[PDB]
């Protein structure tokens, strides 16, 4: 027989991590692996139909994606849906697939609103989620002995679908659910300048441990403002939630990184300012299979899509799709091994959830809620040469923290600053 896979991704724009120009080679490699493996769907072939989720302007919209999904469902009636990645585009599509009892597979859409299975049933997320970042924050708080208060700041920028809103809300809800501590939050505009002054005036009265969701340039400007104001690392600590590693170019294998220098004439001050800043990023795979997959992915993408891919953690986004696709196929086989049909949905989704799988990224696990557990990394600056390096990794499967080559997380004073000063705010 034939198995139909429906893809709803931007087929023209090549600026999103889930763009077709970067996902298509991964899907082709997954299909080739499935064909070369007699264990996965013997005697069956897999097809693929494509649809656009962008308007005439070329950005993902919440109007074109549901229409494309409806048209694909009416014309082809597929068994599974791939994508989209944008939350506003994916939510109506997810609801439509839940109503149609058609399984949905995605690696994007990490908003907390997808965490309820009563509404978004039969939906699997094989990519990173914002709740695992909350788990990492809770684990770090437990390890470092902070139990009283925290502060959260996020920046607003026109043009994107509120990237720093969903992450902050998900992390904040997860921290409240798991740690039971008093947490604050605030939004600021990075385009304005008086907003920075107001932030530096109001931060000392609201807490000492601060998480920031903004651009690397905004983070550097804020750090310089804090340094000139009088803020020091002996009382304050700053965390930057750069998941994809933009301040540190790529976030790839070991190499000296200096994010505080750009030749603006004030690198000396920025080097001293960055002594109180740490970065939280994703964890890159280490096995050589990931490197081979990256090589083949880049080669095939260059030859077949006229696109030149770079090195970075963004490449971890399409690969997950690949792995997820493989997992789905396995589940289907199990259904076909138990006297079922490929048009059930519930059995396949239940078999996928709470399972351990092996892929190019490594050994992944899907819990009972159908959310892949992700590992995290914490970067720290070398006190000798002033270069950032990886010092701590967090495994979400066992929920554990491990150092790298015996590296010690240094502090300006000697031990982490207290969460609340003895004199209070």
């Amino acid at each position: 027989g034939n198995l139909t896979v429906a893809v709803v991704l931007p087929l023209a724009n090549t600026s999103y991590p889930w763009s077709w120009a970067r996902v298509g080679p991964a899907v082709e490699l997954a299909l080739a692996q499935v064909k070369a493996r007699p264990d996965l769907l013997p005697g069956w072939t897999v097809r693929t139909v494509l649809g656009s989720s962008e308007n005439a302007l070329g950005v993902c919209s919440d109007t074109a994606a549901p229409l494309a999904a409806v048209d694909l469902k009416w014309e082809h009636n597929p068994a599974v849906f791939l994508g989209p990645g944008c939350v506003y585009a994916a939510a109506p599509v997810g609801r439509f697939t839940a109503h149609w009892r058609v399984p949905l597979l995605t690696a994007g859409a990490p908003a907390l609103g997808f965490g309820v299975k009563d509404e978004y049933a039969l939906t699997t997320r094989a990519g990173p989620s914002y709740a695992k970042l909350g788990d990492f924050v809770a684990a770090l708080h437990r390890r470092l002995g902070w139990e009283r208060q925290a502060l959260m700041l996020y920046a607003y920028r026109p043009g994107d679908e509120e990237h720093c809103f969903f992450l902050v809300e998900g992390l904040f809800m997860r921290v409240r659910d798991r740690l039971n501590i008093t947490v604050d939050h605030l939004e600021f505009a990075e385009d304005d300048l008086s907003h920075y002054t107001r932030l530096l005036r109001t931060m000392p009265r609201k807490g000492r441990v601060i998480y920031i969701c903004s651009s690397p340039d905004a983070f550097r400007t804020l750090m310089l403002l804090a340094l000139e104001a009088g803020l020091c690392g002996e009382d304050y600590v700053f965390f930057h939630l750069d998941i994809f590693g933009q301040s540190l170019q790529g976030g790839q294998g070991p190499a000296p990184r200096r994010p505080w220098e750009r030749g603006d004439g004030q690198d000396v001050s920025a080097r001293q300012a960055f002594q109180a800043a740490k970065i939280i990023t994703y964890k890159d795979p280490d096995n050589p299979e990931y490197l081979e997959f990256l090589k083949q992915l880049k080669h095939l993408a260059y030859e077949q899509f006229n696109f030149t891919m770079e090195d970075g953690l963004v490449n971890t986004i399409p690969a997950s799709f690949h792995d997820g696709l493989l997992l789905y196929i396995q589940a289907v086989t199990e259904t076909l091994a138990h006297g079922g049909t490929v048009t059930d949905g519930e059995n396949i989704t239940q078999r996928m959830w709470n399972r351990s799988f092996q892929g190019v990224t490594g050994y992944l696990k899907i819990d009972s809620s159908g959310d892949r557990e992700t590992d995290f990394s914490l970067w720290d600056m070398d006190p000798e040469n002033g270069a950032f390096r990886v010092v701590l990794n967090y495994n979400g499967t066992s929920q554990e923290l491990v150092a790298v080559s015996g590296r010690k997380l240094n502090w300006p004073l000697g031990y982490p600053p207290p969460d609340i000063p003895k004199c209070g705010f």
Partner: antibody, heavy 123, light 107 residues
């Protein structure tokens, strides 16, 4: 390839009925087994099917409540048990084989059919 | 589920004529369709196994075609033994049977 059925009993509503289907002449554990019922004047009506080698079963939403299908590979026989019979269960039953099990070709049509058995429910 | 419709409900034709029957599905099915013929007092017998295959032991005068939501069954030349009730069944999902199509002679 042969398919032998036996039974024409009539009984009061609320009792149970058992239908046996014999599939001698071919490898019983190499094909699916479909049970299908047809009303006297309505038309054909798919009931369910079983897969012997993997021990799998599939039934309709409106029939899964009170039907039980089993098999015996020693003599290559299939048994269908229906309970909570009402006045709407007076019909003709057929057992058929179709679709190999080495490859999951469950969409193959039913090749060999049975003679059929008549079940009447009345007090 | 998928509801299946047959056209026409009844048709009268003579011997040696061209006859077509149309089966329509409420949802799109690629090639999952089977055709069965049934005579009174006898079990159904299979004729076409995909939308366009041809089961062993079937005369070549029967043909099947179509795809998507519409399929056609064609008999090039009717014979006195070709008058029976025809059913089109879908196998992509939980199988369902059509209402039937009775064929009779012309008088």
């Amino acid at each position: 390839v042969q398919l032998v059925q036996s039974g024409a009993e009539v009984k009061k509503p609320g009792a149970s009925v058992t239908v046996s289907c014999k599939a001698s002449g071919y490898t019983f554990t190499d094909y699916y087994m479909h049970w299908v019922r047809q009303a006297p004047g309505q038309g054909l009506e798919w009931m369910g099917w079983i897969k012997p080698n993997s021990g799998g079963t599939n039934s309709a939403q409106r029939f899964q409540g009170r039907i039980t299908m089993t098999w015996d590979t020693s003599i290559s026989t299939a048994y269908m048990e229906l309970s909570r019979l009402r006045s709407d269960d007076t019909a003709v039953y057929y057992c058929s084989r179709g679709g190999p099990v080495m490859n999951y070709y469950y969409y193959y049509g039913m090749d060999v059919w049975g003679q059929g058995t008549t079940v009447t429910v009345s007090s | 589920n998928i509801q299946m419709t047959q056209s026409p409900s009844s048709l009268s034709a003579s011997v040696g004529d061209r006859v077509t029957i149309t089966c329509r599905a409420s949802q799109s099915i690629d090639s999952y369709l089977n055709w069965y013929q049934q005579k009174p007092g006898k079990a159904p017998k299979l004729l076409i196994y995909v939308a366009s295959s041809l089961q062993s032991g079937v005369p070549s005068r029967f043909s099947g075609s179509g795809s998507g939501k519409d399929f056609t069954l064609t008999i090039s030349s009717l014979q006195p033994e070709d008058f029976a009730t025809y059913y089109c069944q879908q196998s992509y999902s939980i199988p369902t049977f059509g209402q039937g199509t009775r064929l009779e002679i012309k008088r």
